[PDB]
Amino acid sequence: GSMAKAAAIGIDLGTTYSCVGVFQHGKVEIIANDQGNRTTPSYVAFTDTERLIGDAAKNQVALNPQNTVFDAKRLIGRKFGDPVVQSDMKHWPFQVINDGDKPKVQVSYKGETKAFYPEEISSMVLTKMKEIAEAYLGYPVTNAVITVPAYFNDSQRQATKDAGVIAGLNVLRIINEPTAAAIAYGLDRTGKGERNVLIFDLGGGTFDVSILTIDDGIFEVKATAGDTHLGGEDFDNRLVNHFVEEFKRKHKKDISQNKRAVRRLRTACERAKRTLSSSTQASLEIDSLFEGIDFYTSITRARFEELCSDLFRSTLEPVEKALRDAKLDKAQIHDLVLVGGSTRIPKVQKLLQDFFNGRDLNKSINPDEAVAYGAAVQAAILIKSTRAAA
Numbered sequence: 001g002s003m004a005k006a007a008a009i010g011i012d013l014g015t016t017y018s019c020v021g022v023f024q025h026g027k028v029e030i031i032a033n034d035q036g037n038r039t040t041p042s043y044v045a046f047t048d049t050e051r052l053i054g055d056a057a058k059n060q061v062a063l064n065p066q067n068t069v070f071d072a073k074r075l076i077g078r079k080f081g082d083p084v085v086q087s088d089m090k091h092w093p094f095q096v097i098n099d100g101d102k103p104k105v106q107v108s109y110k111g112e113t114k115a116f117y118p119e120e121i122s123s124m125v126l127t128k129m130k131e132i133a134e135a136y137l138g139y140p141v142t143n144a145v146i147t148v149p150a151y152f153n154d155s156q157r158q159a160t161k162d163a164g165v166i167a168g169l170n171v172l173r174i175i176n177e178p179t180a181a182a183i184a185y186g187l188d189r190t191g192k193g194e195r196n197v198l199i200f201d202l203g204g205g206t207f208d209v210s211i212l213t214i215d216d217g218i219f220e221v222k223a224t225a226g227d228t229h230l231g232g233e234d235f236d237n238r239l240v241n242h243f244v245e246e247f248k249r250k251h252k253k254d255i256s257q258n259k260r261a262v263r264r265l266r267t268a269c270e271r272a273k274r275t276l277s278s279s280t281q282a283s284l285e286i287d288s289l290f291e292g293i294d295f296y297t298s299i300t301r302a303r304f305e306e307l308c309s310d311l312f313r314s315t316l317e318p319v320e321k322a323l324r325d326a327k328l329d330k331a332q333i334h335d336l337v338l339v340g341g342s343t344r345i346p347k348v349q350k351l352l353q354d355f356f357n358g359r360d361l362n363k364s365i366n367p368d369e370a371v372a373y374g375a376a377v378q379a380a381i382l383i384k385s386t387r388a389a390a
């Protein structure tokens with residue numbers, strides 16, 4: 001009669017990390033990759049012998065900075081001359097070249113100099129997400145919903161579809177990341193009447209606030225605001241500067257010029273930062289950090305909170321701006337949704353909850369997984385082909 005249909009997948013194609021989910025048996029499964037990670041770095045590395053994608057690419061970045069590409073989402077659908085592109089290039093160790101006013105990333109790969117369009121790098125990330133899904137399902141996957149930021153224009157949206165097509169995926173739809181997070185909580189299934197939803201998205205490098213109105217399952221983007229210079233990496237930087245000073249006081253040595261020592265310090269700081277989201281203190285233990293000196297220390301959550309206090313408070317400025325742009329008062333917001341790993345920070349949660357006068361935050365779906373979760377819910381809906389009964 002009719003053969004069973006393969007499940008469709010939902011992909012959050014993120015700037016720093018990507019996530020894939022599938023809706024089956026009335027629920028979403030966020031799919032771990034073969035290293036057991038529920039999110040995969042949006043990294044692609046090139047060597048004389050291999051092309052590495054995801055954890056394998058990110059784990060070798062220290063010694064191969066020129067041929068390990070990340071942040072392609074900051075280049076996708078943009079012109080080489082765009083001022084956003086020109087500023088970002090100063091922070092990247094890989095080469096970005098101008099091909100007819102379109103940026104391309106240029107690397108050494110398999111004995112040659114090769115240049116790739118941002119959509120080609122994103123297609124490599126999407127091929128890895130497709131393979132992660134097929135390893136779990138045990139069959140080939142064809143259909144996918146891919147998410148994008150709400151501020152993406154037509155060119156950025158078309159380049160994302162192009163990346164999906166290069167990866168061999170049929171793109172069912174390009175959906176907005178804040179809409180996908182709202183879908184994850186079933187906020188479009190609450191019936192008749194208007195609901196105002198605020199999505200608070202704090203990433204590794206950027207902060208986005210979106211206000212959506214949902215009426216009978218129809219979404220309208222009312223306002224977007226944010227800070228392009230606010231993210232998890234800024235909190236890591238504050239801990240790095242703190243521990244560099246601490247080593248200076250304790251051992252009368254400045255480590256800041258040994259890249260390996262700074263990198264080992266930063267790696268430890270990011271892990272300590274994650275521990276501090278569940279514990280009131282965290283240990284830092286690095287062996288032979290500099291000049292054979294072992295660095296065994298600690299940091300309280302209170303000290304970390306003080307170190308990043310101004311940065312955490314600054315997340316409320318785009319919230320107030322978005323509310324002014326949407327022409328809404330804070331009491332008129334029905335639902336608050338958290339997106340991004342940095343939203344696990346207790347102080348960030350407390351500041352936002354205090355701003356909305358004690359209101360509960362939707363954070364039950366892992367914030368680094370909510371976008372893929374909603375994309376998987378939508379993908380299963382889009383492939384339905386029910387014929388009405390008489």
Ligand SMILES: Nc1ncnc2c1nc(Br)n2[C@@H]1O[C@H](CO)[C@@H](O)[C@H]1O
Binds near residue numbers: 275341342
């Ligand atoms: N539990 C957590 N507590 C604090 N921060 C976290 C946590 N988990 C993740 Br993931 N992050 C940060 O989220 C960003 C994602 O690009 C990075 O800056 C991560 O360090």
Ligand SMILES: [Mg+2]
Binds near residue numbers: 014177
């Ligand atoms: Mg995201």
